[PDB]
Amino acid sequence: AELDSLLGQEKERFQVLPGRDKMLYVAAQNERDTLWARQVLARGDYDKNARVINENEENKRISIWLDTYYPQLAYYRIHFDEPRKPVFWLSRQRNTMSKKELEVLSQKLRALMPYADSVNITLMDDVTAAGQAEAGLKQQALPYSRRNHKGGVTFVIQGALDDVEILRARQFVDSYYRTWGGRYVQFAIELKDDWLKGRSFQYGAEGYIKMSPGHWYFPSPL
Template sequence: MVAAEDNVSDFQPYVIRILNGPLMGCEYPLQAGKILFIVGKHSAVAEEDFFPVLPGDTIYIPLEQDGVNFEITTDNHDPGDGQIALHELRDSGGHTRYVECNTPVRVGGLGIAVRARDEAWSTAVLSYPETGGGKQGKKRRGYLVPGLCLLALAVAIPGAVRLWNTPQHRTAELNALLGDEQHRFKILPGRNHLYYIFARNEQDRLWARQAAVREGYGDSAQVIDADEENKRITTWFDSHYPTLAYYRLHLDNPETPQLWVSRQRTDLNASLRKHLTESLMALLPYARAVDIVPVSDETALSQAEEGLKHRNIPFYRNSKGDDLTFMISGELNDTEIFRAREFIKQYNQKWGERYIQFGIELKNDRNKDRSFRYGKYMYVKTAPDVWNFINPQ
């Protein structure tokens, strides 16, 4: 006879998010199969004889009132169909309904939402209103959530003990650690038994890293952002693929990163592409797949030119081998310099700095502090005893 847990795949096609109560904001990846959710007061759950023997895939969610146990079944539905089966376990009997993914759903007094793993949360889910408590309740939740996330997975439930060191538990712990700021991050388990917290920028990365170290997760969780990862990848490429003409590794979705390579300057046959993909998968343990995307050098070139022209920034091109530099040159004021630097930053975030580079070459105004105007007349003092009068028409 096959054990019940053998019927459950390690594939985790969905993620559930708790929208209210003590665990508001906690998320759990859902394995394919049937997951049981026990919802109720933690004081009652802690009683030794409260539950019979429960299945292995059981998650406890504390809720002070209107708790309704339920099951979510994910093995018969593809994430792409937009619906999922939810079976409520009430005293009056069971009831099955199909709920829309990425949409807030009420099960008794509990608010939840389920999405496909590759999707981002919808605005309706992220803006789901918190009921009651006010600022004081929100402040108290900041202190209670870490402990309650642990309680949700382990207290007094035999079936939940197996979840203690699973991705569901660790992800919930890290989400609780980030508190009200968790929407700024994405947490992924790595194949190397580490967890990766993706930040949007350096400031967020430093904040999350400090929080992780302070709470004792310095060794088990790594906090990274796209720029830091690209620096690491660049160093690795310089050693292992020094001739590869690539632009940038895009981590908009870190589960499926995209490596942009030059269509004109890169010749990857099937064997080389496979070897490169396998190498990147080993280098990026949080990725489920890596896409190698050929892009046109002409597109990169035209976007640089059009971006500078659109902002009325003077420039000229300087080519040297496979490198191309756009030199921004002229008598620029502070506003124009700021506008140029902002464009360069945006361009490099998309295309990187390996093929097209930018330089700023400022020229001084030779007439600064030498030109004067009175009424409609003006003159330039070119020497101590020389004045050039100009009558602008």
């Protein structure tokens, strides 16, 4: 009764990895196949013990460990395109760890994941993270309002947008969260009723003046 025979007919949507603690890991892809694999280990038609992992929930579990032993650490995401050799994307411009105390982090992150073999840490730049989020938001012709501050950046999309700009914004944010993650740059899509889609002006004695971005909006008679 092997594990690859206890799954479905198509033996290419799952992938069984051998563990170091004598436990087999099944790496699914989405939530629908995760309950397809948890049902086999729940009905109990298998002798030994096994676990099911996922890209979305091993990154939620590993940040709970990381923000207790390494607080104030700047990182983005862990990528599992090859699950026996993951890549840990660290921020270069916002931490000053040395080479030896980066290798201790690489060995203590390896002992946390018993299916991996060696975690490779690459240092990503911090300017291109917010640069590709602005250059990908200008390409869809969406109104936005970039707000910079120390250690993060936020893009606010207000206004009474119609149904195509809502769809292109929602289709772009979901394709950006998968690659970079929402640790550094955050999007703020929200609908309210003003025909001026976010921007606001006041008029006196010289023309119009571009006002500062704020929370109060003027409701639009139109």
